Design an enzyme around this catalytic site. Structure first.
Site, mmCIF file in Angstrom:
data_model
loop_
_atom_site.group_PDB
_atom_site.id
_atom_site.type_symbol
_atom_site.label_atom_id
_atom_site.label_comp_id
_atom_site.label_asym_id
_atom_site.label_seq_id
_atom_site.Cartn_x
_atom_site.Cartn_y
_atom_site.Cartn_z
ATOM 1 N N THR A 50 75.558 49.076 43.680
ATOM 2 C CA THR A 50 75.390 47.959 44.603
ATOM 3 C C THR A 50 74.795 48.427 45.924
ATOM 4 O O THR A 50 73.912 47.766 46.482
ATOM 5 C CB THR A 50 76.729 47.257 44.835
ATOM 6 N N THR B 38 80.438 62.433 42.963
ATOM 7 C CA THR B 38 81.386 61.583 42.250
ATOM 8 C C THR B 38 80.683 60.587 41.334
ATOM 9 O O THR B 38 81.266 59.559 40.981
ATOM 10 C CB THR B 38 82.291 60.833 43.230
ATOM 11 N N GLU C 5 62.219 52.731 72.046
ATOM 12 C CA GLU C 5 62.062 54.057 72.634
ATOM 13 C C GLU C 5 62.428 55.148 71.636
ATOM 14 O O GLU C 5 61.739 56.172 71.545
ATOM 15 C CB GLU C 5 62.908 54.172 73.901
HETATM 16 N N1 LIG Z 1 82.157 58.662 53.752
HETATM 17 C C1 LIG Z 1 82.531 57.569 53.095
HETATM 18 N N2 LIG Z 1 81.940 57.257 51.889
HETATM 19 C C2 LIG Z 1 82.316 56.146 51.217
HETATM 20 C C3 LIG Z 1 83.292 55.307 51.727
HETATM 21 N N3 LIG Z 1 83.462 54.290 50.854
HETATM 22 C C4 LIG Z 1 82.615 54.465 49.812
HETATM 23 N N4 LIG Z 1 81.909 55.620 50.021
HETATM 24 C C5 LIG Z 1 80.861 56.200 49.166
HETATM 25 O O1 LIG Z 1 80.375 55.263 48.230
HETATM 26 C C6 LIG Z 1 79.851 55.972 47.128
HETATM 27 C C7 LIG Z 1 79.856 55.093 45.885
HETATM 28 O O2 LIG Z 1 80.210 53.778 46.244
HETATM 29 P P1 LIG Z 1 80.729 52.751 45.121
HETATM 30 O O3 LIG Z 1 81.641 51.699 45.697
HETATM 31 O O4 LIG Z 1 81.411 53.493 43.998
HETATM 32 O O5 LIG Z 1 79.379 52.091 44.555
HETATM 33 P P2 LIG Z 1 78.553 50.991 45.387
HETATM 34 O O6 LIG Z 1 77.575 51.668 46.316
HETATM 35 O O7 LIG Z 1 79.451 50.045 46.142
HETATM 36 O O8 LIG Z 1 77.776 50.248 44.193
HETATM 37 P P3 LIG Z 1 78.598 49.870 42.859
HETATM 38 O O9 LIG Z 1 78.284 50.883 41.785
HETATM 39 O O10 LIG Z 1 78.198 48.506 42.353
HETATM 40 O O11 LIG Z 1 80.075 49.867 43.167
HETATM 41 C C8 LIG Z 1 80.716 57.216 46.996
HETATM 42 O O12 LIG Z 1 79.911 58.344 46.744
HETATM 43 C C9 LIG Z 1 81.395 57.363 48.343
HETATM 44 O O13 LIG Z 1 81.054 58.586 48.946
HETATM 45 C C10 LIG Z 1 83.892 55.612 52.941
HETATM 46 O O14 LIG Z 1 84.764 54.880 53.405
HETATM 47 N N5 LIG Z 1 83.507 56.747 53.622
#
Ligand SMILES: Nc1nc2c(ncn2[C@@H]2O[C@H](COP(=O)(O)OP(=O)(O)OP(=O)(O)O)[C@@H](O)[C@H]2O)c(=O)[nH]1
Ligand SMILES: Nc1nc2c(ncn2[C@@H]2O[C@H](COP(=O)(O)OP(=O)(O)OP(=O)(O)O)[C@@H](O)[C@H]2O)c(=O)[nH]1
Ligand SMILES: Nc1nc2c(ncn2[C@@H]2O[C@H](COP(=O)(O)OP(=O)(O)O)[C@@H](O)[C@H]2O)c(=O)[nH]1
Ligand SMILES: [Mg+2]
Ligand SMILES: [Mg+2]
Lengths: 427, 430, 51, 430
Positions: free
Chosen positions: D136, D170, D245
């Site tokens: 997403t 991940t 800027e």
């Molecule tokens: N640093 C940080 N990374 C986050 C956080 N929440 C989500 N992520 C990152 O989001 C990545 C994957 O997000 P997902 O929710 O699994 O996937 P998405 O981008 O929402 O898209 P979908 O596959 O449809 O769920 C992971 O590699 C996490 O590192 C956060 O609160 N802090």
């Protein structure tokens, strides 16, 4: 104001009518002695439709009871609500039913018809705007099947404008209970087609099926069997008696459901029905009712609509519900199953709502449909009659009463034409 | 003073009117019975003492809907002769309403209306509500309008009717009654607004957070539009608009009269805290296809003329800026031969809330009335539906048996075709 | 110009409570109706069907 | 006046934003309900009675994270119409979010963004957040930017995205999403900032004594950088810096826009007492690779553009002294064709700490933004991983079945390759 006259014919009609009056008496809240004791003022708003008022707060229904044997009237009088009916309205003969169509139509029909017409004419003048007549009879034996056609013809002659509607029971294809039903039903069909505006067909086999699956009755009886039919009648007239968001009387129903004069035989359905051990689980709502109504198993006629095509159909709802929800459910069911409906008549499913639901039920609905599945019922009786009349000497029992054999061929010819008209409009 | 008269025909007209007068009593400040707890002359008649009577007539062949008002709480307000009831439905049959049963009761209603008009010395205009699908709404309404057109001559007969929804249909004979009635309205109605239930249901579900609306919510929203239309003649303002002004500007021709309606801001209570709702915000919401009261996308067609009515704390400066901003939108199409297109009116009376209602208590509101060629889309759908039925003569036997000649059906079909041709011709450009 | 927003805001608070009272009245009534309908089904089966 | 619109996509965007908005509200001093017990236009919008609403739209195809905000403490602050949640997530599939599921909800979000911009009359740019490896996040972001490119034209669309870590991962299909995202980002995005999860994890213990941080701790660090970036538009300062800027100075070429970010001083509550934390310390410690938030060593690459943003007791005399000493560092290399390569801006408002935060109340701080050729190191790793993926056609069937055409994979590979050569050519000396 839109009064209704009720007629009961024969053994089957009287027992169904007895249960039917018990339902409306309970619905309005009439004590068996005939005095009002109900709890809501809405019940007395339009009680004139089915009930007449006598001095002293006693109400008497507009009921006419007809039979050739006195034994049926003995049970009616001995019933719980027997005292409610007017004793003079009990018109009966003194001879056996005969189990014959011609015997009822010619021999005793002429003797009884004059008295019955006068008795009905008494009630016909006690109503300002009598909308139409209502008949309860079966097509099996010949008492109701034979005499009912003669009475229905005479009523049409006297009152052409009024809507003549009948509730008829057809001979079951497997649990038929007379060696000569195909003769009686075939002769009755000819008069039913031309006289009655609206005809509702109910089969006993479907009733036994419905009770066993849903109600799970270990030992069902006619009292349990006739309760469902009483429900269907009460729902149909609910628009006249009570307020609603969209009132729909019988003449509204006739215009919508009937595309052509001869295509007016209908199939009826009722919902909700639940086993009395399963009522805990049901999240009864509007979508749940819609599933029950259009389910083929809840139909009280042993003819599958799926094998045929659907013509115009209507659904009536009782209770408090959202207008949008009812409209959307009809749209969804009409579009999801487009194969069942004819393409050239859009908006097949008519809706209507009445405000007050029946006793005990928070909401309830009734289904009436028109389809070409009636050809299966006519096919069964036509095939049986062909194998009956092949042995042409069996006609002799009807010949004794004056029935010439040429009447049988003409009756089948008209009946065959009805099938062909149903066949033609399939496409 | 300066009076208006309302006529309610059929089930829908009565129920819509019931919601309308509920708003009028609260806005004008009258007890349910008619006693006090101004513009009073404009809507109500004064019976002496401390009692008022509305200038409304309810007509239906069904006694049920009328008897609900007779036994209702507002029974004391309504004068008993104003409530006319029949005996039986019209069976959704236009022939039954127009020829058989309607002629039995038409003279009773006409005499009462003429009696009511005598007290309305400064009267200008009529309002009639219809349900196109219903037999009484179409059969009786066409007969009533034909009589009123010759009885009163040059009076502005405005109408507010419920056009059949594109898909949600409760009557199967609805296309027949819709076309035959349309033939009557296009000849004898000075100006007739349309709405449809399906768009109202979607708007009541999206804008208002109401999961399962009923007819009660739909009626109140329609009443708000009617009150906004009549608010200019009932309260002071910087720009008062009379019924003559609407007739001249909304319609560019005679047969192209049919306008469209919209209202804003339709907002629930909890959102009203969360937003500010300035003049710019409410002006933009009107032209969005989501808020339209008829399920037709304006982007398929063009705009002919538009009229805006404002209520509350509106300042003429902000209206001019908002209108100029709208003109810059390329998504809104206007014909070359109508660059002005807009009339604006301002009134100082804020909208009135109803206890237990569905709408907020906004400081200001705006009503939208305009003419567009997108309404021809709805005409195509009804025209196609009728042709499918008449190809096989699916319901001719019912109508002929009630005294109406069969040759009337092609005449109504031809009249609709000319109307569609007229809209296409006018929408053309040189 | 700044005055009329007070008209909006005061009705704004009170009628939310008014809608809250309407909804609270409705659920309570349906709860009481639910209890009555629970009794109605009870006599339907525990009395009539058991009879 | 002057406004910025924030758009959040995916779990990363939403949960980072929640950390951002807690920082923003306490810094400006607005209660969670929007009431009070300036530069509000930068991120907040005003409603009549004093209730504030943020200028943000939260978008995700999974309703779980959005629902948490709906039942969370901050539920009163956000307008319910701004919180849009889908039905089913993109399942870490770029094709699914780009074609099948994203196109179902794209039209609703764009209307919300366009509607919000009207109240943001002084709009200067958009801030958009994504996760590169997600479905997403990257998949829905590509469609949104492609639409906004034609909707608004010359508007600064800055972005802040989490790049996949060099070793910590991940998601198995993560390289597929990143390169397909990389193709979409490089064309339309004006300037997209880059951070990675792994270096955020390392500094969260190396700079402050937290043994096992979570997403909550990392998001607070991200919000502090964003707050410093937008502090110039929000408060008084000796040297105003606007979004344009940054856009002109940071990027010397169209496709070399991708900058790096750094922040200092990040220090625990107790350790901050022992060090003076003067201007020299904060400026000198910025260039160390330990403080870099992208795990690429600057010594491998070269410096072409740097930007310094200061908040505190900063005096211009110390800034000149600190920068002059930095240029004397033989460890730091600059391209000869860019001798100056520095823009610095000073703002007076000190950073505001969070009750329950993990940072000390440092009297002065500084943010670092720069563009370096050391990021070419990071790009090559992703290219190598993809070639291992596509050599054996590891997960082609999943993406092809969702409507994506197979010919896009070599095209995206070529686009990444061209960027790699472009970085090499620019880094080349003459
Ligand atoms: N640093 C940080 N990374 C986050 C956080 N929440 C989500 N992520 C990152 O989001 C990545 C994957 O997000 P997902 O929710 O699994 O996937 P998405 O981008 O929402 O898209 P979908 O596959 O449809 O769920 C992971 O590699 C996490 O590192 C956060 O609160 N802090
Ligand atoms: N929105 C809305 N529509 C209504 C309401 N009441 C009736 N209608 C409309 O009225 C249409 C049908 O007309 P009827 O209710 O049969 O009234 P009628 O004109 O007297 O019709 P007949 O009785 O056959 O003569 C329905 O399709 C509804 O859309 C209402 O309260 N609100
Ligand atoms: N459902 C139901 N059917 C009945 C009842 N009484 C009789 N019947 C049916 O009616 C059919 C014929 O009844 P009959 O006495 O010949 O009526 P007739 O046609 O008027 O002579 C039989 O097959 C019975 O099954 C009843 O109380 N309920
Ligand atoms: Mg009606
Ligand atoms: Mg996700």
């Amino acid at each position: 104001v839109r009064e209704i006259v009720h007629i009961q014919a024969g053994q089957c009609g009287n027992q169904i009518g007895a249960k039917f009056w018990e339902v409306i008496s309970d619905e309005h809240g009439i004590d068996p002695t005939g005095s009002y004791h109900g709890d809501s003022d809405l019940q007395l708003e339009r009680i004139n439709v089915y009930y007449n008022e006598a001095t002293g707060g006693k109400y008497v229904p507009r009921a006419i009871l007809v039979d050739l044997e006195p034994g049926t009237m003995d049970s009616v009088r001995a019933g719980q609500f027997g005292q409610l009916f007017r004793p003079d309205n009990f018109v009966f003969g003194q001879s056996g039913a005969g189990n014959n169509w011609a015997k009822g139509y010619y021999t005793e029909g002429q003797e009884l018809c004059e008295s019955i017409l006068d008795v009905i004419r008494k009630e016909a003048e006690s109503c300002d705007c009598l909308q139409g007549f209502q008949l309860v009879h079966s097509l099996g034996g010949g008492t109701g099947a034979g005499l009912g056609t003669l009475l229905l013809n005479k009523l049409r002659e006297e009152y052409p404008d009024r809507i003549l509607s009948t509730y008829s029971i057809v001979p079951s294809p497997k649990v038929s209970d007379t060696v000569v039903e195909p003769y009686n039903c075939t002769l009755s069909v000819h008069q039913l087609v031309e006289s009655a505006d609206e005809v509702f067909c109910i089969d006993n086999e479907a009733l036994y099926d419905i009770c066993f699956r849903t109600l799970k009755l270990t030992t069902p009886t006619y009292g349990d069997l006739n309760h469902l039919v009483s429900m269907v009648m009460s729902g149909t007239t609910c628009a006249l008696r009570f307020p609603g968001q969209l009132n729909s009387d019988l003449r509204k129903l006739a215009v919508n459901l009937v595309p052509f004069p001869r295509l007016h035989f209908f199939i009826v359905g009722f919902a909700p029905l639940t086993s009395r051990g399963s009522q805990q689980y049901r999240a009864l709502t509007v979508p749940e009712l819609t599933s029950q109504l259009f389910d083929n198993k809840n139909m009280m006629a042993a003819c599958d609509p799926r094998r045929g095509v659907y013509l115009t159909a209507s659904a009536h709802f009782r209770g408090r519900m959202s207008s949008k929800e009812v409209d959307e459910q009809m749209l969804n069911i009409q579009a999801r199953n487009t194969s069942y409906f004819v393409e050239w008549i859009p908006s097949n499913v008519k809706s209507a709502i009445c405000d007050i639901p029946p006793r005990g039920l928070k909401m309830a609905a009734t289904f009436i449909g028109n389809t070409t599945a009636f050809r299966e019922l006519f096919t069964r009786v036509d095939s049986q009659f062909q194998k009956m009349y092949a042995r042409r000497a069996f006609i002799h029992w009807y010949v004794n009463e004056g029935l010439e054999t040429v009447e049988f061929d003409e009756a089948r010819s008209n009946m065959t034409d009805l099938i062909q008209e149903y066949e033609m409009y399939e496409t | 003073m300066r009076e208006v008269i309302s006529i309610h025909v059929g089930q829908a007209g009565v129920q819509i009117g019931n919601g309308c007068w509920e708003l009028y009593c609260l806005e004008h400040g009258i007890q349910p019975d008619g006693q006090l707890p101004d513009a009073f002359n404009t809507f109500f008649s004064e019976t002496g003492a401390g009692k008022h009577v509305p200038r409304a007539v309810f007509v239906d062949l069904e006694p049920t809907v009328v008897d609900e008002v007779r036994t209702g709480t507002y029974r004391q307000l309504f004068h008993p002769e104003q409530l006319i009831s029949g005996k039986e439905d019209a069976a959704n049959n236009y022939a039954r309403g127009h020829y058989t049963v309607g002629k039995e009761i038409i003279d009773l209603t006409l005499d009462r209306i003429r009696k009511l008009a005598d007290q309305c010395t400064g009267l200008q205009g009529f309002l009639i509500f219809h349900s196109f699908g219903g037999g009484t709404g179409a059969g009786f309404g066409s007969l009533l309008l034909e009589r009123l057109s010759v009885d009163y001559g040059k009076k502005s007969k405005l109408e507010f009717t419920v056009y059949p929804s594109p898909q949600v249909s409760t009557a199967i004979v609805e296309p027949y009654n819709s076309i035959l009635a349309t033939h009557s309205m296009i000849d004898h109605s000075d100006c007739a607004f349309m709405v449809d239930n399906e768009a109202l249901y979607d708007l009541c579900r999206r804008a208002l957070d109401i999961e399962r609306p009923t007819y009660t919510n739909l009626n109140r929203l329609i009443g708000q539009v009617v009150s906004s239309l009549t608010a200019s003649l009932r309260f002071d303002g910087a720009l008062n608009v009379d019924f003559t002004e609407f007739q001249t500007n909304l319609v560019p021709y005679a047969r192209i009269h049919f306008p469209i309606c919209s209202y804003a801001p339709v907002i629930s209570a909890e959102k009203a805290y969360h937003e500010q709702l300035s003049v710019a915000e409410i002006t933009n919401s009107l032209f969005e296809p989501a808020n339209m009261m008829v399920k037709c996308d304006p982007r398929h067609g063009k705009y002919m003329a538009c009229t805006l009515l404002y209520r509350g704390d509106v300042v003429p400066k902000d209206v001019s800026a908002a209108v100029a901003t709208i003109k810059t939108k390329r998504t809104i199409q206007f014909v070359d031969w109508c660059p002005t297109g807009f009339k604006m009116g301002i009134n100082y009376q804020p909208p009135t809330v109803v206890p237990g209602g569905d709408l907020a208590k906004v400081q200001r509101a705006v009503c939208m009335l305009a003419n567009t060629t997108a309404i021809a889309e709805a005409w195509s759908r009804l025209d196609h539906k009728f042709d499918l039925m008449y190809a096989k003569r699916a319901f001719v036997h019912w109508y002929v048996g009630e005294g109406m000649e069969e040759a009337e059906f092609p005449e109504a079909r031809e009249d609709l075709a000319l109307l569609e041709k007229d809209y296409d011709e006018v929408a053309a450009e040189s | 110009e700044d005055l009329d927003e007070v008209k909006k805001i005061n009705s704004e608070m009170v009628a939310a409570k008014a809608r809250t009272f309407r909804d609270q009245q409705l659920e309570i009534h349906r709860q009481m109706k639910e209890d009555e309908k629970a009794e109605e089904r009870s006599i339907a089966d525990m009395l009539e069907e058991n009879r």
